[PDB]
Design an enzyme around this catalytic site. Sequence first.
Site, short mmCIF file in Angstrom:
data_model
loop_
_atom_site.label_atom_id
_atom_site.label_comp_id
_atom_site.label_asym_id
_atom_site.label_seq_id
_atom_site.Cartn_x
_atom_site.Cartn_y
_atom_site.Cartn_z
N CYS A 55 0.67 -1.31 -0.13
CA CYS A 55 -0.18 -0.05 0.01
C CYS A 55 0.89 1.16 0.11
CB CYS A 55 -1.20 -0.07 1.18
SG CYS A 55 -0.19 -0.05 2.95
N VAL B 9 0.04 4.34 -2.59
CA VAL B 9 -0.33 5.70 -2.18
C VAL B 9 0.53 6.66 -3.03
CG1 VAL B 9 -0.11 7.27 -0.30
CG2 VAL B 9 -1.25 4.94 0.04
#
Lengths: 476, 476, 522, 522
Positions: free
Chosen positions: D152, D156
């Site tokens: 993640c 991002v």
Amino acid sequence: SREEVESLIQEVLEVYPEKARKDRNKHLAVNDPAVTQSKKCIISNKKSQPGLMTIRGCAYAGSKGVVWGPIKDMIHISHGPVGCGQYSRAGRRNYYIGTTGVNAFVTMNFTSDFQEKDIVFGGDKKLAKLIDEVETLFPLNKGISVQSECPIGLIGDDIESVSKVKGAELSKTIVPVRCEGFRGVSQSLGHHIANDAVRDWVLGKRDEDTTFASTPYDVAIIGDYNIGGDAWSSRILLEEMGLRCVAQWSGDGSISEIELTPKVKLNLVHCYRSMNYISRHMEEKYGIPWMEYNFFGPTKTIESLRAIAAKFDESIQKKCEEVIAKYKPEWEAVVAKYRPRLEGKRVMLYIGGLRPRHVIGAYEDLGMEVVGTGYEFAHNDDYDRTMKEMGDSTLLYDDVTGYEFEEFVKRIKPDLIGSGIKEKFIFQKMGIPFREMHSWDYSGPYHGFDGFAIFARDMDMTLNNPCWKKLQAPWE
Amino acid sequence: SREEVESLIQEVLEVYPEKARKDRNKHLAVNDPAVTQSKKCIISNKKSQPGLMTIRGCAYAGSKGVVWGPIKDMIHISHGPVGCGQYSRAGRRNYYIGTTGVNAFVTMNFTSDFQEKDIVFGGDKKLAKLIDEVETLFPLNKGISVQSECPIGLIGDDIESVSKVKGAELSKTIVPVRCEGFRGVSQSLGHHIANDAVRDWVLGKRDEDTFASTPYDVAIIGDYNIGGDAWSSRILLEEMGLRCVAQWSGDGSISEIELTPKVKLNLVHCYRSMNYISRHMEEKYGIPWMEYNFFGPTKTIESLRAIAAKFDESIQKKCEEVIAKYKPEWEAVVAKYRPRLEGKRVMLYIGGLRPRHVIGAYEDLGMEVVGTGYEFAHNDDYDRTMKEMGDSTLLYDDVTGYEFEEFVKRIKPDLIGSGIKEKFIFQKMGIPFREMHSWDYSGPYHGFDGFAIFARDMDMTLNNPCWKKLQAPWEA
Amino acid sequence: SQQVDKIKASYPLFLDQDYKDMLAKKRDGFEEKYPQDKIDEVFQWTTTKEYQELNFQREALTVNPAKACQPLGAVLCALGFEKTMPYVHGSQGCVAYFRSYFNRHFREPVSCVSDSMTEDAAVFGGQQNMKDGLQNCKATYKPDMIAVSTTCMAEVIGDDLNAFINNSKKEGFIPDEFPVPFAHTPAFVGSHVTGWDNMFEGIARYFTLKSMDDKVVGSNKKINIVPGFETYLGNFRVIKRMLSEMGVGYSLLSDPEEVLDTPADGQFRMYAGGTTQEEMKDAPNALNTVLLQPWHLEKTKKFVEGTWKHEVPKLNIPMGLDWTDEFLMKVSEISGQPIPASLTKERGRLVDMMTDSHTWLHGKRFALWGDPDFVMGLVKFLLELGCEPVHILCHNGNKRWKKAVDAILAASPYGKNATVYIGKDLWHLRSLVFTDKPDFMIGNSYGKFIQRDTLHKGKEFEVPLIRIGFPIFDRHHLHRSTTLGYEGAMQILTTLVNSILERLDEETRGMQATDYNHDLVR
Amino acid sequence: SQQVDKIKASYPLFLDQDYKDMLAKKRDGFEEKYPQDKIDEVFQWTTTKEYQELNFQREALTVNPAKACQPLGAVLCALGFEKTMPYVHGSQGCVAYFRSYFNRHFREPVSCVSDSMTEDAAVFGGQQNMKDGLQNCKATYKPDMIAVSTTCMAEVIGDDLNAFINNSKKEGFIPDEFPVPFAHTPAFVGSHVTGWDNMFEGIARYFTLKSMDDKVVGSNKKINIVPGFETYLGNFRVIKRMLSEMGVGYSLLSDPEEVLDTPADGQFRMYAGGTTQEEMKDAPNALNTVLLQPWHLEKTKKFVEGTWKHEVPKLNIPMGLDWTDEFLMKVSEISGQPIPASLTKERGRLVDMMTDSHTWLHGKRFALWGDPDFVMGLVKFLLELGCEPVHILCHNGNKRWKKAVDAILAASPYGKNATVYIGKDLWHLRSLVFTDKPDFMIGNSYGKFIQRDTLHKGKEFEVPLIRIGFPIFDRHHLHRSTTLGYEGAMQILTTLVNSILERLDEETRGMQATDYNHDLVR
Ligand code: ICS
Ligand code: ICS
Ligand SMILES: [Fe+3]
Ligand SMILES: [Fe+3]
Ligand code: NA
Ligand code: NA
């Protein structure tokens, strides 16, 4: 040896590309009793090289999984997407006494479960609503911590503002912890981040409290996470010696224990790496001295008890010898039975930040020899302590790669390997007895005299097991 | 279809050799509304034809497995080789309250374990030594029975001499039972042999004794508490104001047996297995006996009223209080399960009572018994069967495996109620099956509480989704 | 009473207060029961070493045997042959018990017939029963073969099976060429496994004794496999699978695998699969005969060596790692086929499971019983796992067998606290698990009553049962399992370790008392 | 203290009195614990319907989720390809968790690498990490392919996987022709199964998107099988077995069965088996593609239909009797092979088992959770057995999926009391099993803590866990089990019925109290 060890290292690094080659050579060294300062011998606490299958975890694991998660009467929020909290749910055996889901919550997984909406809008609103729902459904929690996962800092959330506001609105201890996994190079920075969170948000709560009844023998166990009960089998000895263990950080620890620790006379530090930060701070601010000790095996435990007792008066020192004399026949029976079955057998270790050196004394109490050890995330101050404990011409590997550990073992051919879960099943297939030295392979405790009996039992059962002579089919 | 039934019989018997053919035709009849003397309709209680796979057992099963074995505080010796006792160990669910191995022994297997030496030298010496070892290891036993297996009589042992000698020496009730499996033609003779053993060796013990009698003392004769059948019958009788002094032999104690000559009335459920001792108690003690039926609400209500009519108005008043109490309960059972079972056709094959005794319960659920038969009933049972069975029903005595199979393929009932040796045959044929000996490990089925379980059991099996899956969609 | 929407069966119905009060009145009124304190006192006494010494002095009384009578094995053996009807000469009660006994274990039909000898056959013999029996059986159930054994009644009176069958054919009750092998199977000799041996050797003689002239050892290039008394479907299937994997020609002599597992497809099949008459006829032409369970196949071994001239190799039952290895190596030598990559990998997969699970299995103490070959195979595998087989009980074992098992125990440190018992029953074993408590029992369903007794002393004294063996009546479909070969070793290992872990979870499920050790990961 | 010959581990060591006194001294002195009466009072409150309504009003807090993050599935998918190294672009902590998570379920090595992005990459991107990572990975571990996903962190900040890989080849860090398929796998989207979908579709287009010109549907006469997220070794093996039995040519696309079960024979094998690059390259020439778990293979289906032009048939997961039937019938139609006698018989054997065990299964109420395709297959089979799936929980399910499961429930009387829950967690389920108590739970190891909570209320309220799903950490080698096809249905049935009977034995083990129903035969 020695020259064949140096030769083995260069041989192994011949597969790496030039850049990795050079860096990995800095983290591989052979011990030498004529050198005392490790800063002249090996490099540590550096970034991992990409794509080489490091065994390290992240800063979140260092803070939530290691330091904060064990505190039992607090609720710890894994703030971010669902992964981090699920993979770390109850994977670490930081034992505790409590009624889980009612007044203790260690083995539960609280999470904000970030969706993409929280990425674009931020999660601070969701966190504040989340804190309210925790208050409704778990009224007996005695505080909340917010363990930041990778996205929190990357999107600009301010969990400290949420922590301050909701804390005042609710009159509750709400600790923001910025342990985003991309911070630092390993679990190590999560330790430091987490220590400062305890200092900044919990430890000062009772600076002006005078309602605690102190004794001259008050003490705290710092940096023991009660893996399989390790801290309980250490506390028993300290109180048999006449001491009063006010607090346990953080194995089976309660927030109130944390808050009372500035009231003790002495801090006993087992895990230097993860807890030397808060220990130094307590010396500076509260004048509390701290000392390192070691409860792995009878030799180190006896020595630790005597050093600890020397800090107090003659009455504690008399009890110290009463404890040593009490348990003497017990650990003598353990060695009499298991030392013959393990003597002369060679061990290789790879663990985290303390045990690669801390368990050596126990292996030697069973006649074994540690021919190689290394850490995932230790610093050079740990490696200073490691050389004093490791033998001449031992092999030393920092942040070892999967390829390195494999190749090193193929040539040294130890009789036993003590490491983690990601290594266990590799070497079992190679026909090398393996013992998990984080989880104790779901056994333990290993600390103290009672832990030594289990430890000796565990090494013997695995090393001498009949399964190991059956790896080769009789027909080839 | 009457004429199609007679035609089915002749068709089925076309496979037999001449002798079996002629004999089997005597045991196959179509019921008919104008017949009270069944000996004008069917023959029964004859030897089985060799090699046709009868479902019958032996006299030992009739005595040990059925009559004596349930008596809980006695130890029953299977005297002979090891087979008979092992195959019958705890296979029959004659339930009891006790501490097994201490003061009760129903589900244990005591055996003399005949070796060839006992065949050539006789087993009377071994039996006497065996009785002594029973006394040492099971002191709280309240009597011993000796169930003779096939070899005992064939080799000329005298167990009655051993029973008399050891009985006096030990002051113990030791009952010799000559139920050798080769005696008679089925379990039926084991019943009769066993009844006479009770009379000759147990029942006379307290003739000159234890006892405070009441006008409402009664005994349940011929209920073996399969799944609790007798307990769910006793409850109604004592709710009606009666005092059940004894239960023969389901959950029965030897003391209960010995007190039975003191009761005012004997209630006979299983006529076949217990009419012998009932007739004897009338002759010697003047105790009258009556048959009753507790299968389903219709038969249970009728039995309660008939039983109450034997006493005074106070018992008759309580009788109506019992009927009124349970009325809403069995009405809810039928209201729920009768719609799910109405119009469905049943074929039965069981032992000596239930082939006729459970008809009323099926009809209380709207079902129709289109065929029934016994393994070992006599003509007096078949007299009672014709009044309960419908016009043009199919009647089979000692049905062969081939017969039952062929009869079922053509009649095609919706449900079959029989034994364990038949169950898995017809399930594979896609025909719902309910064990009507063991209650398929369910029950009780007696009384109002048993009717609820019975209706539940018939519905769960007949309407089960498994039955519509016997045919693969690609094999039609 | 009953609530229509939550109907109660016997449990927990009779725990209702009105039933509880009724049962107490029955006891106090008419049962003349010993007082509870006396029951407690005697129970505690039955758990003492003192009671064990009296218990083991028994000579005449047997309590809770762990064996059955010969003809039960003859029936199972006969069921392994194509379209063969098992036929027991004697009284019909035994046959009802044999079928019921097997019905409940396999949860399947079991076809077997009697000739219903009664008091009349006790004075003239069952000759007429045999003549009418064979004719009635052949015509009604249409077998291709009738395999005759005996009930103990027929044995005592002395019926000559051979003469009776010969007369049945001579007088025309059955065609002359219709095969009717026979064996005397006296219940007062040996046990159910002896019946299997007797029946098989009887069938082997029927098809080969008179035809040895044209026989050449090895001429058909197959290996005969004799499974013996076997009640696990997976054990028939694993042997055939491993031999097909090796490319080994074989004849499995007696194979009930099909008839004991017919599909539910709307029709009943009395017969299915099985060894053909022709495989028996041709078996002496095999390279050799392997006995999977030699310790109850002694009579068979003598015939295959005496008449077929085969050199039966000295192989233990193929259970566990070492003995499966030896089985495969001996098969490779006899057949000339090499052990293939697939079985080598399967072996290494079993070893991997052993290394993964050795920490929870190590030192675990077991009580166990069963038939001789099964018991010694279980003992061997436990030693290989690092377990301690403390109480080894084989009711139908002999001194020779006990000596071989003792040598196996003596060759391993994990056999140091082990004892082998022969001729003892499960009431003997009950004493052993009180006086020298193990961690678990491995046995058949009769062990559930030993577990109940131990719990009654106390939860800390309870010895849980692990169901492996025969018969298993209180669980469904375990007869499909496997205990032989690497596959069977993998199944047994999994069952053992997880029974340990299930018991540990139970003992650590106590909230705030013992659940500090209620780990998610084991 | 310790007795050298009977060493105590944590349980029961800390039950010794001196530890018990010490632990009580710790609590009273420094823990400031709530009083026990208050703890009891709050616990009872957590079992109430009142608490459940508050519990189900949650919107922001998740407690005890029943799902994981995308990249975990991308790793398992990549492991199914020959000599393929899973590679997760992002932070190294995730990779340690993925490996550990799979280590504990399979009890095997799990090879996966990171490129260790830190604070420096959080501002400038992981381009340099990717170039050094790919080169270091290829040289050190010598894979034939590197399958790239993302943590993640990488998602991002916005790392362009395609551009970063292209630059790595252009700048000479990895050979141009070295295959490096990739997929974005954001943890804040979907769950672990979505990662599997994303990874597979990424690999499928890498080998086929640019080569469609010479492709002819059906030219290779095979059927592609896409298994999806699958953690039971037996589920890969049963599918390949049934298709070989049918004589159906097939390609199992993503097959980790070998690498997740290597033998312990003295050497470590990082790679083993797996789908070959040529099987992916050639897959568009198949007759069709079958999706074993369609409800988490939506992206894959769009690509296989949009680019390969296959007509993916509408099949449920092959679980239970009806859906295994339909699976085999659709395969027969596509391949033209008839369903063989061996699978028909296996089906009839499953039906026979159902008829044998239906009396104990009927009306039994279950709570259950897991992934969507697994859950609905479990729901379907329970309905077929006559069981009631009362609480159906799929944390990572969607409304469309919930509607289909509700239609399945509506088509059977045994679904009348059933409710399907999506987006709810195991703390939600804990309330359901208190307020609407079922007989058993069917779920993964996380359910053991729900069982512990129910026992604390009372033994009569305890809901035992039956372990079926993922992950299973507290038992050994259940990952070898099977849940698909008739074999999996047979295994699931046996597990269910015997858990019921095991619980009944426990409740009737009380001497003279409940053992009147402790039957030997069930
Ligand atoms: S805290 Fe550290 S990796 Fe000191 S992060 Fe790690 S429970 Fe290790 S060597 Mo797991 S510095 Fe503790 C450790 Fe040691 S989790 Fe445990 S075993 S003594
Ligand atoms: S005693 Fe008889 S065969 Fe009357 S031997 Fe048999 S427990 Fe049957 S039809 Mo099993 S005359 Fe009882 C019987 Fe009926 S064992 Fe039970 S069910 S009511
Ligand atoms: Fe069956
Ligand atoms: Fe493994
Ligand atoms: Na994460
Ligand atoms: Na017998």
